[PDB]
RNA sequence: CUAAGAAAUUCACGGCGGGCUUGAUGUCCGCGUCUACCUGGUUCACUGCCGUGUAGGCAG
C-alpha cells in the first residue's frame, strides 16, 4: 500500500466573480436595476517616501532628487454621490461528490481512500463543516475590506431550483463576528442545505446578495492583478482593478479563500481566530506559515498516516483533512 | 531582529471627490436642489472656467471615514517584527489619549485648511459640518475659519467634542462618519482653480472636482515638530518629507529625526525618541505606505 | 460528451437533428438527466434514433 | 647569397524516363497581490491690446 504519484481533486464550493452595484437602503424591493461601478484609470502624483538605498547612496542622486515629487497612475473606483451602499453579488455551486479523486495511479490506494473518507462521513457528516461555511456566507468575510467600518450589512442568500427563487434568507452580520462561531436556527437551516449539497444528496445553487453600507461616494475595494513576465517594459503600469465587462469585480479565488476560513485547530493563535484552509497552513500576508512539517500537524502527514497505516487522527484533524479534500490540489509525490 | 521587508498600513479619514457647484445666499438652507459649475475652454488649447454673474458662491461636497486600531499592520514577513511592534504600539496607546492628534485634525476640519486657494482674496468664511449616523443628521455643527488663525493650534469650545469623537474614532471606540462641506465667497464672474492630472483642469462630468489626496493631505497638517524653525506653521506629515511650495525639505535623513530611524528605535529595541515626536510618529502610522528593506 | 460540464446541473436537454439535405429530416429531444448515466435501458424515441 | 637562379596546359560536350504513405487516440488538478500619495511644467521666458518706429490704460 503506497500513495499514487499522480493525484488530483476537483474542488467543491465553486464561486464566481462578484459584481458591484450601488444604491440606497430600502429601495431593495426594487433593487434589480442598480448601475454598476466603474474602474477609473487616472494619473495621480505621489511622494518620494521609500527607503533610499545603502548600496550606492549619494546626495548627488538622493538628497537632490528627494525634492522632486513622484509621478504615478493610481486606478481607483469610487461610489456615486447619491449612492451609499455596495451590492456585491455572485453565485455558488455546492457540488458534492467530495471524496473521490479525479486522477489516480493505483486503485488499491483509491480503494483505501474511498473507504477512509466514507468512514469519516458515516459518523460525522458534512454538518459542522457546512455550519462554518454557512457562517462565512453569513458574515461578509468575502468583502475583504469593503465591510471594514460599516454601519449595517444585509446578506440575502437565495436558493434556486428553476428560473426563480425557491428559498430566501436575511442575515444581520455586523453583529456576527469573525472569531467566535456562535450560530442560530436559520444559520442551521442554511447549513443543512450546504450539508445536503456536499453529501451528494441534491443540487445547491446559492445566489448570494451581500449589501454593505459604507457612505456617499466612498472608496470601493475590488481585486488586483499581476502585470509582468510577458512584455515587461520600463514599468509605466502601477496597479489596476479587475473587471468583467465594463464593471469592477472580485476574482473567484479570493471569494473561495474567504469562504474556506475554517481552520481553528492549529497551535499558534488558537483564541485569535480562524484562518484559511491550506496545506502547510499559511497566511502569506502574515509571512509565517502555521502548521509546520517539523511537527505532526500538516495535511501531507495526516493524510498518509490516516490512509496507509490506519492511524486515525484526532476528531478535528479529520475536519482539517476533509477541508483539504474539498479544497483540491495536486497531491501524491 | 532587524527591519521589515514589506509593510502595508491602511488609510484613515478618506474623503470623496469635492465637487464644485454654485448658488446664491439665503438659499443656502435650501441647498439639496442646487445647480453646478461649468467647464469650458478658450484660445494653445487650454481649459479655464468661470462662475456666473448671479453667484459669489462656490460649494464643496465630501465625507469622511475613520477605521480604528491603526497600530496593527496588514503585511509583513517577520512574525517577530509583529511581536516587537505590539509592545510599542500598545505603549503609545495606553499611557495617553489621542486628543493631541484630534485637535490638529479637527481644527483643519473647522478652519479653511481644505479651502486652500478658496480664500485668496475672500472676506467672510462660513463652513458647515455634519455628523451622520443614518438617513438624517443628529449632531450638527457650523464652523468658522476667521477665528482660529491658520498657523496656530489654539483650541475653542466647539473643538473638544469633535476631538473626543474622532479620538473615539481612530482608536476603535466607535466608527464615525463625518460629512465636511463648505460654501464659498469667490467673486461675481471669477476664475476657478480645480485639480488636474499629471492644459486640462480635472473635469468630472457636468461638474468640477478635486481628488481624494488633496483633502486627505489637507486634514493632516500635523508636522509642526520639524526641526529647523517652528515659527512658520503646520506642514503635513511625510516620511522623507519634501515640499515643493516651501521648497526646502524638512526632516533630512543625514541627521537623526527622519521616520526610517525613529521607527527603528521607537519600535524595536524599546528606546524612545522624544515626546515632541510621538504624534508625528503615529501620524506616519495613520498615513501608510510601503516601508521595506 | 459533457464531461465535467454536466456535473451539478439543474436541467440538461439534448437535441439531435438528422440532416439528409440542406433541410433537417427528423428531430429528437431528450431529458439527459432522466436517461441514466449507467444503464442502457430502452424506450421508443431512443430506439427511433 | 635561402635544394638559390628560369618557365602559357590548352581545347570540346543532352543524363534521361516512371511512381497512392497509410491507419488510431481524454492532459487533468489547486490557488487572497498588498499598501502609498499636492502638475497653477511657463499644454510659448509672454499672447492678444492706441504708431509697422524701442514710451502705455488691459482677462494679469
From Swiss-Prot, chain B:
Where does this protein have coiled-coil stretches? none
Pfam family name, one: Cas_Csy3
Q: Where is the signal peptide, in residue numbers?
A: none
- Mention one GO biological process in which this protein takes part, according to its record: defense response to virus
User: What keywords would UniProt list here?
Assistant: Antiviral defense
Q: Does the keyword Coiled coil apply?
A: no
Q: What happens when the gene is disrupted?
A: Mutants lose phage DMS3 infection-dependent inhibition of biofilm formation while there is normal biofilm formation in the absence of phage infection. Decreased production of crRNA in the presence or absence of phage. Disruption of the entire Y.pestis-subtype CRISPR region disrupts crRNA production but does not alter phage resistance (possibly OLNs PA14_33350 to PA14_33310, and the flanking CRISPR loci), indicating this CRISPR is not involved in phage resistance.
Regarding protein family, the annotation reads: Belongs to the CRISPR-associated Csy3 family.
Q: How is this protein organized at the quaternary level?
A: Part of the Csy ribonucleoprotein complex with a probable stoichiometry of Csy1(1),Csy2(1),Csy3(6),Cas6/Csy4(1)-crRNA(1). A Csy3(6),Cas6/Csy4(1)-crRNA(1) subcomplex is also formed.
Q: What else is known?
A: In this bacteria, Y.pestis-subtype CRISPRs do not confer resistance to phage DMS3 or MP22, but instead are required for DMS3 infection-dependent inhibition of biofilm formation and possibly motility.
Q: What does this protein do?
A: CRISPR (clustered regularly interspaced short palindromic repeat) is an adaptive immune system that provides protection against mobile genetic elements (viruses, transposable elements and conjugative plasmids). CRISPR clusters contain sequences complementary to antecedent mobile elements and target invading nucleic acids. CRISPR clusters are transcribed and processed into CRISPR RNA (crRNA). Cas3 and Cascade participate in CRISPR interference, the third stage of CRISPR immunity (Potential). Involved in crRNA production or stability.
Would you tell me the protein name for this molecule?
CRISPR-associated protein Csy3
